[PDB]
Design a binder for this molecule. Structure first.
Ligand code: CLA
Ligand code: CLA
Ligand code: CLA
Ligand code: CLA
Ligand code: CLA
Ligand code: CLA
Ligand code: CLA
Ligand code: CLA
Ligand code: CLA
Ligand code: BCR
Ligand code: SF4
Lengths: 63, 160, 41, 80, 91, 203, 192
């Protein structure tokens, strides 16, 4: 599943720090039952200092 | 204009010139006439007399306090109080705003974009600080071409 | 100078060198052209 | 007392439990992540409300979330 | 001066406008706007017994639906205009 | 091709097709796609208004120095009275400039659209390139047509004579601001004492 | 075709009478707004074409302009001189109450038409000479808005000449312009 590994996606999740921000997909989990399989890496950190977050494919579009 | 006499014919403005030299002349009375601190007060008096003869020759408006007041409405007599040095300012302030904006675009497409802001790339900086000379033609040029503003779909927006 | 000029290009040094030049320029404008309240040009 | 809620964005990184100073959080099995575990708050009546779990949660936005509600002698942290 | 003719003609002019001119404009707007509505229901439908629209007072015998409230509304404007005219003339 | 600065790379937008191209865009004022089409039209009116400007600033002042016209100076020509009011002649100009420049505005925006007459449509302008309205009203001698290498030379001669006139007219402006003397007399005061009549002496 | 070569917008196709594509600000972009703007452009113009003979012909016959023939209502006694003759019913509460009755009955009957084309050009009783039921129909509607926009520009001229030069009328602005036309223009208003 997922759009593609190594692709550029835009986050549609409202409560994330990287909403409407360009991110790079580093891992998509193909195991069933995982709610947020797509792991997206960002060039900028959030207030917690991390750049790695998991999103569903419904919360991302290819840009 | 606005009930203010011109400073060249203001009796209060000439009173402040009289009582400023008299304050400095009484400071000069306790020094030798060829001494080094007396040359500073003598240069202060000539700086004061240059100042009062410059304010009256520019068509400044003086109130009842004997002080030069600025008319910032955009009067044809009063352009050098606000309009002329405001356009001089905004050109310089837009120069600061255009070469800082163009530096961030030039370092966002780099390998480590955050190390180029603590350590400012001077050959990259100085090649666009010259380019900030013609910035109204480049800001409205980027405004007309759409490169000045970013679309709201690519802008980080806090949720409702 | 691969690293000495990198230190000289840092944010506090370049702020000191620019504002040293900036306040150096505005003081020297205020010597030859002092008490400037109205731009004549 | 305090209501600690775990959401489905959790990755099972366990550091919310490790940051807990009053043993509220525990890791239960789950099927929604790679680690196959999610946090839970059974002893939420023992929660002081310090939000050390929210400081240690790497998920954006947070998976563990502490809501400061009615405060008792557990959640006030008193010894007298 | 001439209070008995100025007030009567100005009330009769606004009542002529209320009956023959602006009565399709008023009857369309009281149906398009309708009764006041809170949260999808009428104030009387929500439980307010004092917000019931009266129908015995609104029971008109005029063929165009011109009731005594419209008499009390358009005739009130005819006295407001009529005392605007009388105050302007007597000056 | 020769450039404005030897050892400097020419910009990617100025490729050398345009007449008068010496790779001179240091501040990048014509980089953007579609922008160099506007800046040539801007250069062409400015160069032709300056050659019209230099023929009305220097040539009547030079013949005043000889004394066969007795025309007033150009910076005091706004104070001169005529058969019309000086304020009135501004607005009659910008009603005629509202026609002539908006016909020119549509040529830059939509080329090949306003070459036909608004009244008698058999009269059509023969110009093909943008900014060169060939026709009986503007080029009656037909010097704007021929080979492309021959046409590039005469278009190079408009702008090289035009950039000189722009510098000229900008020079007369600042000369009349700080010296208050007309510019033919500024030339004749520079052929008498050249090392004492300089911009530092005039401040 | 208000600018040759300019792309006409999709909501202005040219089939309307006077559709020259002049909408730079896009006010008629909304379709239901544009249907009101077409019946507004014509009532305005028809009132303006009833106004240009109402300004010049009282001025050319010598009974003053459209301003000095209008200041009598602010005066307590003006007596309402019409063609040099004071009408007996010419009082300010009398002529305003008739105007707030007769025009309001005319405008309410005008707004009652459900058809969006009979609102524009009604015909019938308002066309007794039968030119609407004739061979030419499209060019007369083009004649309506070309004459109408000329009188609409004329009334804008009429109003701002009174603001710029109070106490004078439009034929008196024409007589002032016809004497020395190169000195007394809009530049007297632009440059004080
Ligand atoms: C790189 C240049 C750059 C650019 C083009 C602008 C331009 C913008 N900023 Mg500013 N700003 C900058 C630097 C910049 N800023 C920096 C360095 C800081 C930290 C001091 C801020 C802090 C900041 C605040 C606190 C505010 C803005 C806002 C604004 C807007 C109006 C200008 C203003 O308020 O006065 C400028 C404001 C200042 C505080 C002065 C800082 C400008 C410095 C001196 C320039 C340094 C550049 C140089 C290369 C390093 C505009 C979008 C306002 C906004 O939200 O938008 C409407 C606003 O509230 N900015
Ligand atoms: C935004 C606020 C502001 C503005 C509009 C000005 C602008 C001005 N000040 Mg300044 N001033 C300000 C803030 C401001 N000041 C502050 C914050 C300080 C305290 C550090 C002073 C202290 C100051 C000094 C000591 C001098 C100026 C002078 C001047 C002039 C600069 C002329 C030149 O070429 O240099 C100009 C009228 C000089 C001048 O000509 O005085 C009129 C001068 O004497 N100002
Ligand atoms: C308003 C004046 C004006 C305009 C429209 C241009 C336009 C053009 N010039 Mg330029 N040129 C001019 C003045 C002008 N020139 C004059 C007077 C000189 C002689 C000093 C030249 C010398 C010159 C050379 C040698 C060349 C250009 C070229 C260019 C082109 C690309 C750069 C550009 O877009 O500049 C845009 C410029 C402006 C919008 C003017 C901005 C002026 C700023 C605001 C203030 C400057 C202050 C001034 C020094 C006093 C474009 C066709 C190149 C080309 O290919 O031409 C076909 C080329 O190589 N120019
Ligand atoms: C855009 C270019 C420009 C502009 C601003 C003007 C405008 C001016 N010139 Mg000038 N001039 C120009 C180009 C320019 N000139 C050129 C191309 C030449 C020919 C080489 C001259 C030759 C010239 C002469 C001989 C005189 C002027 C004079 C005039 C004034 C009135 C023109 C006139 O008599 O109406 C002409 C109207 C027509 C319809 C033609 C005015 C200040 C006159 C002046 O200074 O006032 C006494 C004057 O006698 N000019
Ligand atoms: C130094 C003067 C100079 C030069 C070299 C040219 C050169 C050119 N112009 Mg230009 N132009 C100039 C002045 C100049 N112009 C000025 C001052 C104006 C404003 C009145 C114009 C207005 C203008 C337009 C709008 C058009 C041209 C066109 C022409 C072209 C053919 C005509 C020709 O050979 O002119 C030769 C020029 C001279 C011999 C100078 C005569 C100097 C007298 C004696 C003074 C050629 C590219 C035409 C074109 O390209 O159409 C296809 C065209 O219609 N030019
Ligand atoms: C076609 C270009 C050109 C030509 C041949 C001249 C020629 C002349 N100018 Mg000059 N001038 C020019 C453009 C031109 N100028 C420009 C573009 C400016 C505006 C910044 C000036 C501003 C100017 C001033 C303020 C003064 C002159 C004066 C002079 C004379 C002495 C040179 C000098 O000290 O100033 C040279 C100044 C420059 C800025 C050089 C610019 C020249 C390049 C080619 C452009 C000389 C006869 C002086 C005078 O009155 O003579 C008695 C004088 O007081 N000019
Ligand atoms: C109140 C008068 C009035 C109104 C309702 C309109 C309405 C309209 N005109 Mg317009 N027109 C009028 C006066 C009027 N005009 C006059 C005075 C002129 C001559 C200058 C024209 C010249 C004109 C042309 C040439 C064309 C139109 C067309 C249009 C249509 C689309 C443009 C639009 O939405 O404009 C909306 C305009 C308004 C709502 C007017 C108010 C504007 C603001 C609020 C005040 C402006 C003050 C003014 C600048 C002084 C629409 C039917 C086009 C069409 O298809 O016609 C059928 C067409 O091509 N008009
Ligand atoms: C919108 C159209 C309109 C409006 C409201 C006005 C309004 C006015 N006109 Mg006027 N007029 C109009 C069109 C109009 N005119 C046209 C088209 C003509 C040509 C027939 C005239 C010819 C005309 C004359 C010759 C006179 C007036 C006068 C009057 C005034 C008194 C009218 C009166 O006594 O009623 C009369 C009502 C009936 C006969 C019914 C009034 C201010 C008078 C004026 O300006 O005061 C001196 C005047 O003497 N008008
Ligand atoms: C089609 C209608 C039309 C016509 C034929 C006239 C005719 C007249 N007006 Mg008028 N006027 C008009 C529209 C019109 N105007 C509009 C809409 C405005 C607002 C911009 C004015 C503003 C106005 C003022 C306040 C003045 C005139 C003046 C004049 C005279 C022309 C000189 C001038 O400066 O013109 C100005 C014309 C325009 C700015 C636009 C004209 C557009 C048409 C279509 C051409 C002339 C008697 C002057 C006069 O005689 O008084 C001494 C005067 O000073 N008019
Ligand atoms: C025709 C007809 C008829 C009759 C009718 C009638 C006769 C009517 C009348 C009516 C009327 C008789 C009405 C009235 C009304 C009134 C009113 C309604 C009033 C009110 C008032 C007001 C409210 C005012 C106010 C004021 C005051 C108080 C003071 C201050 C100022 C003012 C002015 C504001 C019938 C039915 C038989 C049928 C047939 C037809
Ligand atoms: S710290 Fe956050 S992401 Fe990690 S296990 Fe606890 S709730 Fe889940």
């Amino acid at each position: 599943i997922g759009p593609k590994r190594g692709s550029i996606v835009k986050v549609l999740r409202r409560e994330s720090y990287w909403f409407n921000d360009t991110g790079k997909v580093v891992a998509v989990d193909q195991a069933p039952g995982v709610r947020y399989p797509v792991v997206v890496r960002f060039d900028k950190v959030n207030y917690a200092g991390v750049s790695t977050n998991n999103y569903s494919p419904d919360e991302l579009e290819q840009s | 204009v606005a009930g203010l006499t011109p400073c060249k014919e203001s009796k209060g403005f000439a009173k402040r010139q009289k009582q400023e030299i008299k304050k400095l002349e009484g400071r000069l009375k306790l020094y030798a006439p060829d001494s080094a601190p007396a040359l500073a007060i003598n240069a202060t008096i000539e700086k004061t007399k240059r100042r009062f003869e410059f304010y009256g020759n520019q068509g400044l408006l003086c109130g009842t306090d004997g002080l030069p007041h600025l008319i910032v409405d955009g009067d044809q007599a009063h352009l050098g109080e606000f309009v002329y040095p405001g356009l001089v300012f905004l050109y310089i302030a837009g120069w600061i705003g255009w070469v800082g904006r163009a530096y961030l675009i030039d370092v966002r497409t780099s390998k480590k974009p955050t190390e180029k802001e603590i350590i400012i790339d001077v050959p990259l900086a100085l090649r666009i600080m010259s380019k900030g000379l013609t910035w109204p033609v480049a800001a409205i040029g980027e405004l007309r071409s759409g490169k000045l503003v970013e679309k709201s779909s690519n802008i980080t927006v806090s949720p409702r | 100078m691969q690293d000495v000029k990198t230190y000289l290009s840092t944010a506090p040094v370049l702020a000191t060198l620019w504002f040293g030049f900036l306040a150096g320029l505005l003081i020297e404008i205020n010597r030859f052209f002092p008490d400037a309240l109205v731009l004549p040009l | 007392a305090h209501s600690v809620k775990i959401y489905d964005t959790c990755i099972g990184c366990t550091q919310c439990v490790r940051a807990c100073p009053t043993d509220v959080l525990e890791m239960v099995p789950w099927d929604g992540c790679k680690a196959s575990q999610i946090a839970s708050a059974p002893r939420t009546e023992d929660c002081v409300g310090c939000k050390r779990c929210e400081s240690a949660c790497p998920t954006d936005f947070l998976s563990v979330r502490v809501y400061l509600g009615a405060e008792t002698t557990r959640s006030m942290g008193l010894a007298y | 001066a001439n209070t008995a003719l100025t007030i009567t003609l100005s009330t009769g002019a606004l009542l002529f406008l209320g009956r023959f001119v602006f009565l399709p404009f008023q009857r369309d707007n009281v149906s398009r706007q309708g009764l006041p509505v809170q949260n999808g229901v009428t104030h009387f439908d929500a439980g307010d017994s004092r917000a019931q629209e009266v129908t015995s007072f609104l029971k008109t015998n005029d063929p165009a639906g011109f009731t005594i409230v419209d008499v009390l509304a358009w005739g009130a404007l005819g006295h407001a205009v009529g005392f605007f005219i009388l105050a302007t003339i007597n000056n | 091709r020769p450039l404005w600065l030897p050892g400097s790379e020419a910009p990617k937008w100025l490729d050398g097709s345009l007449p008068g191209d010496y790779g001179f865009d240091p501040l990048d004022l014509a980089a953007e796609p579609g922008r160099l089409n506007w800046m040539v039209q801007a250069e062409l009116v400015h160069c032709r208004w300056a050659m019209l400007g230099a023929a009305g600033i220097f040539i009547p002042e030079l013949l005043t120095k000889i004394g066969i016209l007795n025309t007033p100076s150009w910076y005091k020509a706004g104070d001169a009275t005529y058969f019309a009011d000086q304020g009135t002649l501004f607005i009659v100009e910008l009603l005629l400039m509202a026609w002539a420049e908006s016909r020119r505005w549509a040529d830059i925006a939509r080329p090949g659209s306003v070459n036909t007459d608004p009244i008698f449509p058999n009269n059509k302008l023969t110009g093909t390139d943008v900014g060169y309205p060939g026709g009986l009203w503007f080029d009656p001698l037909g010097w704007g047509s021929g080979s492309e290498d021959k046409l590039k030379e005469i278009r190079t001669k408009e702008v090289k004579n035009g950039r000189l006139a722009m510098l000229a007219v900008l020079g007369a402006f600042v000369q009349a601001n700080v010296t208050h003397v007309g510019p033919i007399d500024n030339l004749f005061a520079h052929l008498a004492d050249p090392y004492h009549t300089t911009i530092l002496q005039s401040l | 075709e208000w600018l040759p070569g300019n792309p006409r917008p999709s909501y202005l196709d040219g089939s309307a009478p006077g559709d020259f594509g002049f909408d730079p600000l896009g006010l008629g972009e909304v379709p239901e707004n544009l249907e009101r703007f077409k019946e507004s452009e014509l009532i305005h113009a028809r009132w303006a074409m009833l106004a240009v003979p109402g300004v010049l012909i009282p001025e050319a016959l010598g009974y003053g302009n459209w301003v000095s023939a209008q200041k009598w209502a602010a005066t307590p006694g003006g007596q309402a001189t019409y063609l040099g003759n004071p009408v007996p019913w010419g009082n300010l509460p009398v002529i305003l109450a008739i105007e707030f009755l007769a025009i309001a009955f005319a405008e309410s009957q005008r707004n009652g038409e459900p058809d969006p084309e009979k609102r524009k050009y009604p015909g019938g009783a308002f066309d007794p000479l039968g030119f609407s039921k004739g061979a030419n129909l499209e060019e007369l509607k083009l004649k309506e808005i070309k004459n109408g926009r000329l009188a609409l520009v004329a009334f804008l001229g009429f109003a701002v000449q009174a603001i710029a030069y109070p106490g004078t009328g439009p034929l008196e602005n024409l007589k002032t312009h016809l004497a020395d036309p190169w000195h007394n223009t809009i530049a007297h208003v632009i440059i004080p």
